C-alpha cells in the first residue's frame, strides 16, 4: 500500500489567526473587490468559523472556509493574475470544498461521512470505506508539422482563441495512449515523437494537465463538430489569437514555434 | 468526457474476453483470464459492458461474484501489457460503480450513464466519473549509483524506488521534489519524465521520472521506509519484478551508469 499525505485537521478560527482565506462553496470563492481575502480573521467576519489549513504562501497560512457569502462569489479564474503558487492554493481550496460536499454520504453504503483527522480524506460512520480528493489527469498536446502547428477553436466558446488539443485520460490507459486517442477522435490525425514538457493543475473543476509535444505522422484533418468549430495548420511565423501568457497551452505553442525557428531559420 | 458503448445483456453467441469482477478481484479459472463463448462460462443473460478490444475480440466487464478462483489482477500481470491494462480497467470500473451506489451529495441511489462511464443521481443533478490517482515514481541517480529503499509496508526484501501520490493543486514536478525530500531528505535535479502506466492497486496512474542528486544526506521517514541507501549499478540488491515500471526505471538508470563507468 501507498499512503496519502498527512495533514492538519480543521479547527475553529480565532482572532489571532491570519492569512489568505479561500471562502468557497459550489465551485466558487469569495473575492471582495475582485480580490482574494487577506488579513486577520475578524476583518472578514470569520472568527468562530471552522477553517482548514491548505497551505502557506510566503510565510502566511492559506485557509479554507466552507461558506457562501451574499456577494462577490466568483470563479477562481478571476484571480489567475496572482503568483502561480498562490493561484494553485486557491484552486486547492475550491477543489477541497467540492470534495467534502461530494462526500456528505458514503457512495458504498449511503451513510453519513466525516472528515479524517490526519489526512484529506472522508471516512464513513457505518462501513470501512473512504475517499480522497479526485484529480482528473488530462493530456494537452501541441502538434507540429514541419513549419506549422495545429490550432483549433472549440465550438463551445466563440472567443476567437485558437489553442491546442486537450482531453481527459480514461481508466486503464497511459498518458501516451490518451494523447494518441484524443488527437484521433478530435482531428483524425495520427501523431508521433511524443515528448512530455510539463504539468499544471487546472481547477476547472479538478484537472491535472500533462503537456506534450508531438509530430504529425499521417491523416486528414477531420474535426468532430461537437468538440471543434475548426482546426488548421498555421505557420510558426503567422499565428492567430492564442491562449494567454501563463497557460500551459501558450507555453507549448511557444516551444513549438521556437524549434521551427531553430530548424527553418 | 468521452462517450462509450452502453451495457447490455449477454447472448449465447457472445464472445471475447471476460473480466468478471466483484470487490477488487476478478475470475481467473485455473489462473487464466476467461476467453471464449459466453455459454462456456454460463454467462448468458448477465449484463455486460464492453470495456475494449484485444486483438479483434471484445473485452467485457461482468459484475458478478463466482464461488472459486476470484483473485487479484496482479495474477494476470504476465499477460501482454495491453491485455493487462484492459483487465485492470474492468476491475477499476467495477469498483467505481460499487463505490457510487449512493450519491455522496444527497444520499439517493445512483444509476449508470449509457453515454459514458459515469454514475448519475436519481434525485440531484450531480455526477461522478471514475477516480484515477496520479502517483509519481522516481529513480534517483548519483554518479555511479542509484537510490533504492526498502518499504515498511511489507517485509519484501525488495529494494525499489520512491513513489507517492500527487496532491491536489500540485504539479508532477513539485510532487517528485516533495516526496523525495519527505521520504529521504535529499534535493534532486534535472527531473526527466520517462513514461506512465495505469496501476490498478486500486486506481493509480504511475508517472515515471528520473532525477539526479543535488544535495542532502539520506534521512529516512521511518513510517514509510525501513532503510534507504545508494547502490552501485554493478552491485544491485533485490529489485522489483520485470513487469513493473519500478524495474524499468532502475534498468534505465543502471543502463546509463554502465555507459559512463
Ligand atoms: Zn459507508
Ligand atoms: Zn444526489
Swiss-Prot record, chain B:
Alphabetized PROSITE patterns for the sequence: NUDIX, NUDIX_BOX
Effect of residue 165 to A: Abolished deNADding activity
Binding site for substrate: 30, 74, 116, 129, 197-204, 246
UniProt motif Nudix box: location: 164-185
GO biological process: mRNA catabolic process; mRNA stabilization; NAD catabolic process; NAD-cap decapping; NADH metabolic process; NADP catabolic process
Cofactors, names only: Mg(2+); Mn(2+); Zn(2+)
Annotated effect of mutating residue 199 to A: Abolished deNADding activity
Effect recorded for residue 193 to A/Q: Abolished deNADding activity without disrupting homodimerization
Coiled-coil residues: none
Effect recorded for residue 224 to Q: Abolished deNADding activity
Impact after mutating residue 183 to Q: Abolished deNADding activity
Binding positions (a divalent metal cation 1): 163, 183, 224
Matches recorded under CDD domains: NUDIX_NADH_pyrophosphatase_Nudt13
Manner of cofactor binding, per the entry note: Divalent metal cations. Mg(2+) or Mn(2+).
Reported effect, residue 219 to A: Abolished deNADding activity
Effect of residue 74 to A: Does not affect deNADding activity
Variant or mutagenesis effect after changing residue 179 to Q: Abolished deNADding activity
pH dependence remark: Optimum pH is 8.5.
Free-text function comment from the UniProt entry: mRNA decapping enzyme that specifically removes the nicotinamide adenine dinucleotide (NAD) cap from a subset of mRNAs by hydrolyzing the diphosphate linkage to produce nicotinamide mononucleotide (NMN) and 5' monophosphate mRNA. The NAD-cap is present at the 5'-end of some mRNAs and stabilizes RNA against 5'-processing. Has preference for mRNAs with a 5'-end purine. Catalyzes the hydrolysis of a broad range of dinucleotide pyrophosphates, but uniquely prefers the reduced form of NADH.
Subunit structure: Homodimer.
Name of the protein described by the UniProt record: NAD-capped RNA hydrolase NudC
Organism encoding this protein: Escherichia coli (strain K12)
